[PDB]
Structures are given as structure tokens and as C-alpha cells.
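User: For a reading group we're discussing how well predicted structures match intuition. Take Parvulin-like peptidyl-prolyl isomerase. Before you show the prediction, I'll give you the sequence so everyone sees exactly what went in.
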Amino acid sequence: GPMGSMADKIKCSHILVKKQGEALAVQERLKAGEKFGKLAKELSIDGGSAKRDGSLGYFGRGKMVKPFEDAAFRLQVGEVSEPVKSEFGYHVIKRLG
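Assistant: Thanks. Here is the predicted 3D structure of Parvulin-like peptidyl-prolyl isomerase, as C-alpha cells, for the group to look at:
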């Protein structure tokens, strides 16, 4: 039982790309060994938020969009989630905490 209690929130990151086809690719290549945050500045078009490597950090039920928040707590394994398109664009989610 190592130190690290309390985890009501989810610790994930997000990326955005207009080329919806890439979103499907990055998710594939993301696990290749590259860091999610890297893609943030690499190909992610996400505004300022991308400057923080998309480090969404601990979020709860009421911070991200409905489609995103849903996939936010679905990939507890720590992987990329299906191409989620919100009012912002084609999002991506890789658990990181």
C-alpha cells in the first residue's frame, strides 16, 4: 500500500487535430513509445492548453465535455481512446497521473 490515496478525479491528457484521420493514427502510434504530451506540441492544434502538454491532470465528473469526460474514466488502463469529436474538434485521451 504505497502513498497515493484519494483519486476521485481522473488523470489524463488531450490532443486535437482537424485531420480526423490522424487522430485515429496518433492513437495507434501513441502507444508506440511516444509521450502523449509530446503530440500536444507536436501535432496537436489545441489552443494554449496544448502548451502544457495537454496535462489534464486530476479531473472530476464536471470538468470536460460529455463525450470526453465519458472516455476520460473508461481508459483506466492508460491507453488512447476512440476518436472523440466535440465542439472543439477531434479529441484524444491517454491516461496520465
